[PDB]
A paper describes a structure:
Here, we present a high-resolution crystal structure of Mu8.1 obtained from a new crystal condition in the high-symmetry space group I4222 at 1.67 Å resolution. The structure reveals a dimer interface equivalent to that previously observed in Mu8.1; however, in the present crystal structure it is formed between two symmetry-related molecules. The high-resolution structure of Mu8.1 obtained in this work allowed us to identify a tightly coordinated hydrogen-bond network around Lys55. The network of water molecules revealed at 1.67 Å resolution surrounds a potential functional residue, Lys55, and may contribute to the unusually low pK a value (8.16) predicted for Lys55 by PROPKA. The relatively low side-chain pK a could imply that Lys55 is uncharged in the dimer, thus rationalizing how it can be accommodated at the hydrophobic dimer interface. Overall, we propose that the combination of this side-chain stacking and the observed hydrogen-bonding network creates a hydrophobic microenvironment surrounding Lys55 that results in a lowering of the pK a of its ɛ-amino group.
The Mu8.1 conotoxin from Conus mucronatus is the founding member of the newly identified saposin-like conotoxin class of conotoxins and has been shown to target Cav2.3, a voltage-gated calcium channel. Two recently published crystal structures of C. mucronatus Mu8.1 revealed an all-helical molecule forming a homodimer, with a common dimer interface observed in two different crystal conditions. Each protomer in the dimer comprises five disulfide bonds connecting the four α-helices and shows structural similarity to saposin-like proteins as well as con-ikot-ikot from C. striatus. Five disulfide bonds contribute to the overall rigidity of the toxin by forming both interdomain and intradomain connections, referred to by the roman numerals I–V. The first domain is stabilized by two disulfide bonds formed by Cys18–Cys34 (I) and Cys22–Cys30 (II), both connecting α1 and α2.
Numbering used by the authors:
A (entry chain A), B (entry chain A): 5 to 89
């Protein structure tokens, strides 16, 4: 897949666990840990686009589950995906 | 300032230098280096919003200088800033 380098399921599971523990700065801290484990490829801009689409949806609303499933099906990390995700 | 933790001028100067050297994956590699130097606070979502606004503008067009000046004046890192930046 074109986004395999982004480790996005790993990011998802990190954010869910971090929020379950009620920790501060989960987006930042998960991003950082995944960088430490899997390197700079997880911070490319296409990864950023997917994450922003997913996290805006998960911030501005609820059901993390539809936020993930919808982003995963319709977002390829193109900058244009922000217009609809 | 509310975005001082994001080290965004540092990011800007990194991206400009990296692109001047014609290197691969400058967005990713600058993000990663700034994380290594200044920690997880540089990866908060408000930082992500500012960077995405700036970099989309700098990708979809040119004059990096107006992309920076406009984002810096009108983007506070609110998720809603994506609608207009
Ligand atoms: Na990112
Ligand atoms: Na980021
Ligand atoms: Zn892993
Ligand atoms: Zn520094």
């Amino acid at each position: 897949d074109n986004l395999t380098h982004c480790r996005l399921f790993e990011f998802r599971l990190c954010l869910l666990e971090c929020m379950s523990l009620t920790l501060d700065h989960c987006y930042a801290r998960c991003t950082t840990v995944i960088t430490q484990i899997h390197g700079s490829d997880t911070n490319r801009f296409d990864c950023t686009i997917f994450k922003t689409c997913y996290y805006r949806c998960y911030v501005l609303g609820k059901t993390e589950d539809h936020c993930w499933k919808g982003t995963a099906t319709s977002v390829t990390g193109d900058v244009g995906d922000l217009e609809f995700c």
